[PDB]
Amino acid sequence: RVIVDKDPVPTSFEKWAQPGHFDRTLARGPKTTTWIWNLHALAHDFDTHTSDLEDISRKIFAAHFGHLAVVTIWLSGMIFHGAKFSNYEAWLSDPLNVRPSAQVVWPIVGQDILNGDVGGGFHGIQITSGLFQVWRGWGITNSFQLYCTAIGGLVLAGLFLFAGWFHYHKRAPKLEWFQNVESMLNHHLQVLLGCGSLGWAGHLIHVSAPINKLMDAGVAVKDIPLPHEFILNKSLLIDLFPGFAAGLTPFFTLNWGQYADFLTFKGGLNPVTGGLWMTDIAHHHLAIAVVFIIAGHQYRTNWGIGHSIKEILENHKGPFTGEGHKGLYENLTTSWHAQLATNLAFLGSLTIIIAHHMYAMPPYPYLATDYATQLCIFTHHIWIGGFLIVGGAAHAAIFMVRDYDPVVNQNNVLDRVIRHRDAIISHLNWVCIFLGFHSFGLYIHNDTMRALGRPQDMFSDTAIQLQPVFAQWVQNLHTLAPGGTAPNALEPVSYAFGGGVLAVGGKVAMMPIALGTADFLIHHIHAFTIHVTVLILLKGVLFARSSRLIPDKANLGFRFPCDGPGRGGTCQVSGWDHVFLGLFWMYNSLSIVIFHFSWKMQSDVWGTVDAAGNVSHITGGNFAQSAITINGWLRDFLWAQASQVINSYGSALSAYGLMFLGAHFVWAFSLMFLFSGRGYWQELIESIVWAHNKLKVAPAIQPRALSITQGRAVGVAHYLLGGIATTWAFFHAHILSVG
Amino acid sequence: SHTVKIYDTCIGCTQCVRACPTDVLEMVPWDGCKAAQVASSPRTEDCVGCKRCETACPTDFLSIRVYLGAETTRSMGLAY
Amino acid sequence: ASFLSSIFVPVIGWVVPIATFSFLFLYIERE
Amino acid sequence: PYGVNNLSVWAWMFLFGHLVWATGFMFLISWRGYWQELIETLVWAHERTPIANLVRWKDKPVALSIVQARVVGLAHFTVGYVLTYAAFLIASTAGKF
Amino acid sequence: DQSSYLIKFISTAPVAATIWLTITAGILIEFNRFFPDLLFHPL
Amino acid sequence: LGADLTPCAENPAFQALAKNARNTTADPQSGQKRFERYSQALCGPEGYPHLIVDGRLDRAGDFLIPSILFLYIAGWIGWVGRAYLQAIKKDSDTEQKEIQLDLGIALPIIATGFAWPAAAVKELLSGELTAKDSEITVSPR
Amino acid sequence: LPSDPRNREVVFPAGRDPQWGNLETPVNASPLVKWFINNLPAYRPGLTPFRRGLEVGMAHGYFLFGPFAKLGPLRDAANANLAGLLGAIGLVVLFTLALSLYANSNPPTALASVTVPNPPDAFQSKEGWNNFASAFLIGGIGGAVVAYFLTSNLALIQGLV
Amino acid sequence: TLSGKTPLFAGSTGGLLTKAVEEEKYAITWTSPKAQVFELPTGGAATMHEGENLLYIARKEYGIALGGQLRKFKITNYKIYRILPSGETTFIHPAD
Ligand code: CLA
Ligand code: CLA
Ligand code: CLA
Ligand code: CLA
Ligand SMILES: CC1=C(/C=C/C(C)=C/C=C/C(C)=C/C=C/C=C(C)/C=C/C=C(C)/C=C/C2=C(C)CCCC2(C)C)C(C)(C)CCC1
Ligand SMILES: CC1=C(C/C=C(\C)CCC[C@H](C)CCC[C@H](C)CCCC(C)C)C(=O)c2ccccc2C1=O
Ligand SMILES: CC1=C(C/C=C(\C)CCC[C@H](C)CCC[C@H](C)CCCC(C)C)C(=O)c2ccccc2C1=O
Ligand code: SF4
Ligand code: SF4
Ligand code: SF4
């Protein structure tokens, strides 16, 4: 059922001339400097214009081709910069010694000292993004395979940018093309995910795992043949992988045990690279692919068979929840924020799961070997996952103000959480308080007992145990799963649970992580800082429309500063302001997750193995008796590990010395916007406009102070920028030195 | 409660009466302005200090002004 | 006479705030 | 974890000063109207709890006023600014002479 | 006239200030490749 | 002299920093040509050139020469921006020309004003530089 | 596990007036919970206000021997259980103040929830709250002695049983 | 008296509180053309009856915030009373 409008919007440079053409109030011309900031704020907010959902949805789908172009330009840029300006061909010969490097610096002002010696006769910035592990995991051998990929990416970036013109300015879809969410889920689960992972399963079997097996033998780099000669000359897929001469017929006679050489279930880490077995990833992405192609045949399309989501949701209702899930289809098929809240809180929560499932199970050749890479991949996608969960909480509060409808959402499970929203929050208010005392106060207890010279009264491994019984048990189940509850495996899912120490050269790839009293406290700090973040975000969702303080808060809007100084004072009551307060706790919560990671792994996992198997860790094993006091987090983590970032002048780590101080500045700069108010700064400009009125330099566009909401927004953007960039420059200069 | 002073400069715009959410304000006839009515605040024990009435008034400077005074239960906005 | 610390410090630590707060709470809540 | 010495008050007051300083940000970034809508849920869940509603306030709990938690915010800020440096000024000098 | 809209777009606020600050920054960069280290005027 | 200022060409600390020169640009002797020009400055006990902002004509290259070179440029940034805001005040829009530059008016303002010390005195002596205090808005006292 | 059975509900509102801010849930009005809370000594019918605080003091004074004696500072010494007795008696007295401090401040009237349809009529007068306070100190001290008597010789009661 | 019907909702946790016993309590009456879904200022959705309705609210702020929500239903007949705990009902909206 494809119906497409023919030329809705003429392609012209007319509207590039006048700025702010989109809104009727904002297009009449600027009068103050408030107009300048509202142009960049209301820019990509396509929902405020009309009530025509057909017209808004065409802008939304075409702009989504715009973001696909800039990711592809970025991605093909990283391959092209890794083609010319890298040591990728010298890295393949010795990944144990050659450091991953791109970004050669122009030598102008003495910043050629940033081009330090990474090994291999090459001077440049030691990268930490791990693209050399990806390209080897893809099987790229020489530079020319990186050129044709990057040049191929620039063509593929042009098709996305052309179709964004085409599907908006030339051939734009109608409304009912978008609301075929049964037809969307069938194509996107099968063709994108299932056929994407089936095609990629064909890329490991025919191409990648033959090359990565020849690499593990230590043959050469040039002497390994081209990967299209593996398809032509079938005699090289039979020297390795001997279960290949039987050909294609064991697939169709269900003799799938014939394929046991290259679709294995080894279940562990490769002892040569310290990565996953390439044959296990082949049987993974194939078994992933069968499940998606089956499950994408679920929802009903033009051919009668299939489930209907309006008939799935309306059956699931109970005695407690009244009408149940009846009415949630119309919320998710009309509102765009209800989709955007759902696709972002569950993709942001997915990104944190990816970070945990990649440090313990390193999926790339020589990933766990490089400590400088593995620390930064975790801490990157932690923050990327955390901003999106706050965004799903943000665009859910926008749903409640603009797109919530009482007629549809009558007595369903969305309605029944607004009746008992006082019971939800106040029982959540108790747990945030309960976790505050019984997790953080056990650090304040241990600060004081060690300061009072009473070490026998502390919550440590020696004095008063707090052993994590329910997580020491689950590690013992996942250690004993080969031969038992999963007999076909050999080693566990990872060595983080049990198993042994797998050394790659000298450096530990993965060691069994032993949980103790310090690990009990810091996993309950994590539950504390997450439940408080939920408390702030959910209060902005439930109290978005009204409260007992403001009975008509949805009348004012999603984003308004206050309702005046009355009722004691009602500043920061809006649903925007609870997104504002949750960004700090998201910053607070995720900063401890990446501090728990960066010091548990250095104290209890990473290090160098001697000849007899003795594992000599980085920090000597001091997480046990020092991560129980706040003095110990200050002494042995912030003070002791910063000796590589501030002593780095006159060397190649000089930029991390400058970004460490430069981010302490921008953090401190943000407090001028947070602490002060707007009405001070408007008075000060009136005394500066006077001296600009006197000498006849009076601007026609009147200066105004930043608005109340913007002064909060500037103060949190400069806050999060300088606080994360402090840690960005602290993690790198510490781990590009001890790794 | 609070204190709502209404000066003689307003024009009878009826934007302040249609914005006070506890309905403190009302229009009385007054032969001064062009619309021949002035805002009046006969129920200032109900005023919650919202200053929606000062936001909606056109005239420069404001004909209506809310002076924040002693805060009883009705002006704190307490349902309890 | 260093034993006076054992009798002035608990009085100022315990007895002085208990006597003060129980006076002030009954004084501020007094119609 | 090896022991203490005579600087352990100043090591404790230094951490104490970093905590009073950071507490005062809560009164300044977050403003009143978030907190009056939070206390109105605690007023609810105290009148509903069956044993604990034998007792009840004489003064109705309201959040701190706008001018008040700029005083209270500046008080935690200034006390923590003083005690942090005064523990660093003494012990970095009285530990080296 | 389609060409007049490109002169009128090249002279808005962020577009003119991007080009003018690029010419400004490029003068300081290409002056410092050839004559570096100018702490003071040598007299 | 100066003071605590020996010349840099006499210091053993400066000549010790001369033997370990780091090249600024890809010029292989840019580390060396840097120090033959810094030999005429006054390096203290550390070996670093300490500038003299006094007004002494033997140390005029520190601050006397760059101050004249700066004040010609930065006043001309503000003189051109003053003459353009005088021009667009007497137009129909007056706020379109602020964000969206009237380039046909702006470029005659830019190329003209390089003789602004010959200009800015003439508005001063004629009193057109300033405005009357009975014509500027002021706060209630 | 179908209840009535495909139908109907449990969150009918409190007292059939939906405009009151309370609801009847399986934690509110499940008749095992409603029978329990109505028969605590704060709420049981037929009790003197001295009689109500006598059981409340013996219960709260009983378990507060616990965390002082086994987690306090003297918990390795010979006075490990005597340190928990003086801490428990010493903190009932801090609660006896707070009851008398609450009572003398002209205290407000007690509430009437949905699991408890009336306040027990002795909690609206200053004289009523004072008898509850005098009973709490007597029962609180005595309830901590009988916790001190049992735990100080755990081998003896187990041999004598 | 007041004599109005009560709208259809399953009860809220907002509702009325101890002030409705102690200090005062308000109540808004409106005569509706039909039965339809509106919003409670206490929180959630409800369903008005046909003819005279009645909603016991906590404060006067609620009934005038509700009356603006009723204005887009072509309902400009809402009258708020002030019901004191001594039984004293005071007509306060409108003034006449
Ligand atoms: C899938 C991603 C996604 C999408 C499509 C949207 C889309 C939208 N959001 Mg949303 N949002 C998201 C993620 C997303 N958001 C996340 C992750 C958060 C949490 C932080 C939010 C928080 C949020 C709020 C709080 C609000 C929106 C609003 C909006 C709407 C208008 C936004 C606009 O015009 O901005 C225009 C663009 C800007 C103003 C530029 C902002 C630049 C940022 C602050 C700085 C970026 C820092 C950068 C990385 C470092 C630069 C360094 C520098 C030196 C160069 C629009 C529908 C607004 C609205 O009213 O909705 C109707 C609104 O109030 N969103
Ligand atoms: C170091 C600074 C700091 C501290 C201590 C707090 C503390 C708190 N914030 Mg908070 N906040 C802060 C900074 C801080 N914030 C900042 C900078 C912002 C700006 C964005 C916010 C924004 C914010 C919001 C938006 C929210 C909070 C919430 C909370 C509460 C969480 C409950 C809890 O854990 O209490 C437990 C107490 C502690 C962990 C402190 C330790 C106390 C020890 C254990 C005991 C005291 C020792 C001793 C007995 C004292 C008595 C001595 C005697 C002589 C008097 C709590 C009051 C949330 C809340 O109230 O809901 C629950 C909430 O919604 N805050
Ligand atoms: C500045 C006043 C002050 C003084 C003098 C003390 C003194 C003491 N504190 Mg302490 N404390 C204080 C302030 C003070 N504290 C503050 C402000 C806090 C909050 C951070 C604490 C938190 C604290 C904790 C958490 C603990 C102590 C403990 C102790 C005792 C340690 C010695 C010992 O082994 O007990 C041996 C003695 C006993 C076990 C029992 C002694 C008899 C008790 C004190 C009273 C007996 C009845 C009394 C006479 C009448 C009723 C009490 C009366 C105050 C109304 C000692 C009595 C420890 C302790 O034992 O507490 C009970 C302990 O666990 N303190
Ligand atoms: C099936 C249940 C049952 C159990 C577990 C017991 C257990 C016991 N009986 Mg027995 N008894 C039972 C049924 C039972 N009886 C029936 C049905 C009859 C009727 C024919 C009897 C008649 C009977 C007599 C006549 C005697 C016993 C005795 C005993 C005790 C012998 C061990 C000893 O030397 O005491 C050592 C222990 C003690 C002397 C004291 C232990 C502490 C007591 C039991 C309670 C302490 C306070 C308590 C915690 C709280 C109040 C009591 C509570 C039940 C409300 C032992 C506790 C003898 C005994 O000692 O009785 C006291 C005894 O003389 N029994
Ligand atoms: C509900 C429930 C529960 C809870 C409960 C509890 C836990 C309780 C507690 C308990 C306790 C808390 C106990 C108490 C008891 C008491 C007693 C046992 C007392 C005694 C006392 C006495 C014996 C004393 C006497 C005296 C006096 C009074 C005075 C004089 C002196 C003398 C000493 C003689 C559980 C969890 C199971 C589960 C579910 C259900
Ligand atoms: C500084 C500050 C201001 C004043 C800040 C303003 C007005 C922003 C001005 C900063 C920019 C950089 C000025 C840019 C002016 C021109 C557009 C740029 C001229 C130069 C061009 C070449 C770009 C507030 O209004 C305010 C309000 C509420 C809380 C905190 C604050 C606050 O901290
Ligand atoms: C926490 C907080 C609250 C809630 C906090 C309240 C209501 C008080 C919390 C402290 C309680 C009352 C205990 C006080 C104990 C103190 C540690 C010491 C008190 C002793 C002195 C009073 C002598 C606000 O109402 C508020 C309003 C406007 C801006 C910021 C804030 C704000 O930050
Ligand atoms: S944000 Fe400012 S103006 Fe608004 S209520 Fe708060 S203090 Fe008053
Ligand atoms: S005070 Fe304002 S709203 Fe009222 S009549 Fe005068 S101008 Fe109109
Ligand atoms: S105090 Fe202000 S906003 Fe509130 S009712 Fe009176 S005039 Fe209106």
The enclosing domain of F86 has a CATH number of 1.10.8.110
Phi, psi of H71 (to 5 degrees): -70, -30
G84 C-beta closer than 6 A to ligand 3: no
Write the residue with the smallest CA distance to atom 6 of ligand 10.
B47
Tell me how far apart the alpha carbons of residues A316 and A329 are, in angstroms, rounded to a whole number. Answer: 13
Report CB contact under 8 Å: G106, C29. Answer: yes
Distance CA A254, CA H13 (A): 61
- Which contacts of G122-131 are long-range, i.e. CB under 8 A and separated by 24 or more positions? G122/G48, G122/G49, G122/G52, G123/D54, G123/G49, G128/G49, G129/G49, G129/G99, G129/G102, G129/G103, G130/G100, G130/G103, G130/G104, G131/G48, G131/G49, G131/G50, G131/G53
Q: Is the peptide bond before B61 cis (omega within 30 degrees of 0)?
A: yes
State whether residue A15 sits within 8 Å of chain F by CB. Answer: no
β-bridge mates for residue G23, sequence order: G13
Between chains, do E8 and A17 touch, taking CB under 8 Å as contact? yes
Best of B1, B2, B18, B50 to disrupt the A interface (most A CBs within 10 Å) is B50
**B67 φ/ψ angles, rounded to the nearest 5 degrees:** -95, 120
Question: B40: part of which helix (H) or strand (E)?
Answer: strand B37-40
Interchain pair E41, F60: CB under 8 A: yes
Q: Kindly determine whether residue F98 and residue A36, on different chains, have CB atoms separated by under 8 Å.
A: no
Phi, psi (deg, nearest 5) at residue D4: -130, 175
Domain span at residue F41?
1-141
- Nearest CA owner, ligand 5 atom 31: G142
C-alpha to C-alpha distance for H41 and A552, rounded to whole angstroms: 7
Which CATH architecture does the domain made up of A1-739 adopt?
Up-down Bundle (1.20)
Task: Give A427→chain B minimum CA distance, Å.
Answer: 19
Q: Which of B49, B71, B76 sits opposite A564 (nearest CB)?
A: B49
Residue E30: list chain A partners with CB under 8 A: none
Say yes or no for a CB contact (<8 Å) between H95 and B22.
no
Q: Dig out the tokens for B73 from the structure.
A: 């239960």
Amino acid at B43: R
What separation in Å is there between the alpha carbon of H42 and the centre of ligand 8?
Answer: 25
A 10 A CB-CB count for A278 gives 26
Residue H70 at interface with chain A, using a CB cutoff of 8 Å? no
Alpha-carbon dihedral A564, A565, A569, A573, rounded to 10 degrees: 20
A286: nearest Cα among A261, A262, A318, A252:
A262
Which residues in chain G have their CB less than 8 angstroms from residue H13's CB? Answer: 21-23
Residues with CB under 6 A from ligand 6: A 672-673, 676, 678, 681, 705-706, 711; E 17
Burial A666-702 (b: 16+ CB within 10 A, else e): bbeebeebbbeebeebeeeeeeebeeebbebebebbe
Angle at A459 between CA A458 and CA A465, to 5 degrees: 125
CB atoms G9 and A322 under 8 Å: yes
| Nearest CA among H67, H60, H49 for reference residue H9 | H49
Nearest CA to ligand 5 atom 14: G59
Q: In sequence order, what DSSP letters do the residues of G51-97 get, joined into one string?
A: HHHHHHHHHHHHHTHHHHHHHSTTTTSTTTTHHHHHHHHHHHHHHHH
Buried b (16+ CB within 10 A) or exposed e, A461-473: eeebebebeeeee
- For the domain that residue B26 is a member of, what is the CATH number? 3.30.70.20
CA angle E32, E37, E42 (to 5 degrees): 110
**Could you tell me if B73 and H59 are in contact, meaning their C-beta atoms sit under 8 angstroms apart?**
no
SS3 of H13-48: CCCCCCHHHHCCCEEEECEECCCCEEECCCCCEEEC
What's the CA gap between H90 and H26, in Å, rounded?
9
Q: How far apart are CA A167 and CA A62, in angstroms?
A: 6
Q: Do chains A and H touch (3 or more CB pairs under 8 A)?
A: yes
- Rounded to whole angstroms, how far apart are CA atoms F108 and B73? 67
Tell me the backbone φ, ψ of residue A320, rounded to 5 degrees.
-75, -40
User: Would strands A607-609 and A615-617 be described as parallel, antiparallel, or unpaired?
Assistant: antiparallel
* Facing D43 at nearest CB: one of B73, B76, B80: B80
Assign 3-state DSSP to chain A and report helix, strand, coil percentages, each to 5: 55, 5, 40
Ligand 1 and A345: CB distance under 6 A: no
Query: Does H58 reach chain B within 8 Å, measured CB to CB?
Result: yes
Query: H-helix or E-strand containing A451?
Result: helix A441-451
CA separation for the pair B48, B19 (Å, rounded): 13
Question: What whole-number distance in Å separates Cα of residue E17 and Cα of residue G82?
Answer: 80
DSSP state for residue F93 in the 8-state scheme: -
Binary contact (H65, A422; C-beta < 8 A): no
Distance between CA G141 and CA A650 in Å, rounded? 72
Query: How many separate domains does chain F show?
Result: 1
Chain D: list its partners (3+ Cβ pairs within 8 Å). A, B, G, H
Token readout for A177 is 């093309």
The C-alpha atoms of residue A318 and residue A700 are separated, in whole angstroms, by 64
Quick one: which of H74, H85, H75, H66 has its CA closest to H28? H66
Q: How far is CA A546 from the centre of its chain?
A: 33
Using a CB–CB cut-off of 8 Å, the residues of G that contact D are 21-22, 37, 40, 42-43, 102, 105-111, 113, 115-116, 119, 123
- Asked if F116 and F77 touch (Cβ cutoff 8 Å), the reply is no
Domains of chain E: 1-43 (1.20.5.510)
Looking at residue A739, the DSSP 8-state letter turns out to be -
**Solved by what technique?**
cryo-EM
User: Which residue has a Cα nearest atom 30 of ligand 3?
Assistant: G73
- The tokens for A548 are 């007992």
- Choose the closest CB to D31 out of A547, A572, A632: A572
CA A346 – CA H66 distance, rounded (Å):
36
Q: Do D58 and G108 touch (CB under 8 A)?
A: yes
Name the strand (E) or helix (H) holding A596: helix A575-604
How far is it, in rounded angstroms, from Cα H55 to Cα H4? 8
Resolution (Å) of this entry: 3.3
Domain limits at B77?
Answer: 1-80
For D19, the token pair is: 């905590």
Residues of chain F neighbouring A700 (CB-CB closer than 8 A): 85, 88-89, 94-95, 97-98
For chain B, the domain total comes to 1
What HEC string does A113-167 produce? Answer: HHCEECCCCCEEEECCCCHHHHHHHHCCCCCHHHHHHHHHHHHHHHHHHHHHHHH
CA of G161 to the centre of ligand 4 (A): 7
CB of A513 within 8 A of CB of A472? Answer: no
In terms of Cα–Cα distance, which of B43, B21, B14, B25 is closest to H64? B21
Tell me the CA distances in angstroms from A437 to A148, A525, A529, D29, D63, one per residue in order: 58, 10, 12, 23, 22
From first CA to last CA, the distance across chain G in angstroms is 45
Q: What DSSP character marks residue G13?
A: B
Secondary structure class of D61 (helix, strand, coil): coil
* CA-based R_g, chain B, Å: 13
CA distance A619 to A601: 10
- Type of residue found at D41: T
Task: Give me the domains of chain H, ranges plus CATH numbers.
Answer: 2-96 (3.30.1470.10)
What is the token pair recorded at A378?
Answer: 């975790």
Query: A171-173 and H89-91: which strand pairing?
Result: unpaired
A419 half-sphere exposure, CB direction, 13 A CA radius: 26
In degrees and rounded to multiples of 5, residue A279 shows phi and psi of -75, -30
For residue A577, give both structure tokens: 């302001």
How many angstroms away from the CA of A522 is the closest CA of chain D? 19
